Design a protein around this ligand. Structure first.
Ligand SMILES: Cc1c(N)cccc1C(=O)N[C@H](C)c1cccc2ccccc12
Ligand SMILES: [Cl-]
Ligand SMILES: [Cl-]
Ligand SMILES: [Zn+2]
Ligand SMILES: [Zn+2]
Ligand SMILES: [Zn+2]
Ligand SMILES: [Zn+2]
Length: 308
């Protein structure tokens, strides 16, 4: 039988396999829709199908770099292992967002996936960008399997939305983003650093974008005030340890609810549309008011300068 071997599922390579030998002896580690067939001999109904293989020549290595933006040999295999599960998850439309039916601890992925459908991101690696597009359109198995691989998580492992968003933002074009903070000490006085890229969109310490513009209470080298002078991003992520927080319809984009123990707990997603919508995977609920344990709030921005 003839088959196609790729690394990216774009450059397909016709292959004349031997039927008596395993894939493993001929190509090296070989996969089919995420399922490892390394140790299997070719069945007949495998004829002319696409198998992913671990880059075993320079052409393939270069093609893998250009599609995934990593040369880590574990990557292809971790991706394939995730996909082998994520492809059996369900991806219902809830309030015109692709969510995930709860399975294999995916609270955090659903929340990241819903959040990503509501903010402006361009992913640098083609495999992320192509899968993201496919995901907003309702088929998201690849996109979730990729998030798992890129974040060094595996199916069932407990995940933080804020770490996940953080890892993913490092594969997105934010080069053009900018945060100017000014920090004020009673004794040291004033200093302002610029931050760029990921560090420009994410702050750990309070949920309220308002409070950040009005400044917050951080330590000094000698108890100071860090305030926000200038923001140039399409959004901001404001994060803090879970605390009872009030969400007011129209003052934020969307948010992460986190209920339970450090790590063992469960993420839900609140999005501000015409009313407040709470998406718990496949389950949807709505109310005009919301008060509950929030850990991340996303906000819309273009260009803010301070009047201070
Ligand atoms: C940290 C983590 C990991 N590594 C994996 C899965 C979930 C969490 C978590 O508890 N995250 C929440 C949002 C969280 C993040 C940060 C501080 C927290 C303190 C108490 C309870 C929860 C806290
Ligand atoms: Cl890179
Ligand atoms: Cl990248
Ligand atoms: Zn090629
Ligand atoms: Zn890259
Ligand atoms: Zn599974
Ligand atoms: Zn000081």
């Amino acid at each position: 039988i003839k088959v196609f071997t790729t690394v990216d599922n774009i450059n397909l390579h016709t292959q004349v396999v031997d039927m008596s030998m395993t894939y493993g002896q001929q190509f090296g580690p070989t996969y089919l829709d995420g399922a490892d067939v390394t140790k299997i001999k070719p069945h007949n109904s495998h004829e002319g199908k696409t198998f992913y293989v671990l880059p075993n020549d320079d052409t393939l290595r270069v093609e893998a770099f250009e599609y995934y933006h990593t040369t880590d040999p574990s990557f292809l295999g971790r991706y394939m292992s995730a996909l082998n599960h994520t492809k059996k998850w369900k991806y219902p439309q809830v309030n015109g967002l692709t969510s995930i039916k709860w399975a294999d601890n995916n609270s955090y992925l659903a929340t990241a996936l819903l959040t990503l459908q509501q903010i402006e991101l361009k992913f640098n690696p083609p495999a992320l960008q192509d899968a993201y597009y496919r995901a907003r359109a309702g088929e998201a198995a690849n996109f979730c399997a990729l998030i798992l691989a890129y974040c060094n998580k595996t199916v069932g492992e407990l995940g933080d939305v804020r770490e996940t968003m953080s890892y993913l933002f490092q594969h997105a074009n934010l080069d053009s983003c900018k945060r100017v903070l000014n920090v004020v000490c009673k004794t040291c006085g004033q200093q302002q650093t610029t931050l760029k890229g990921v560090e420009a969109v994410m702050y750990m310490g309070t949920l309220s974008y308002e409070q950040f513009k009005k400044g917050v209470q951080i330590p000094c080298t000698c108890q100071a005030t860090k305030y926000l002078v200038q923001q140039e991003s399409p959004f901001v992520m404001m994060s803090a340890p879970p605390a009872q927080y009030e969400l007011k319809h129209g003052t934020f984009t969307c948010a992460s609810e986190y209920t339970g123990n450090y790590q063992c707990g469960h993420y839900k997603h609140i999005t501000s549309k015409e009313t407040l919508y709470c998406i718990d995977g496949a389950l949807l609920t709505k109310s005009s008011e919301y008060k509950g344990p929030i850990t991340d709030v996303f906000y819309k921005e273009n260009s803010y300068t301070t009047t201070i």
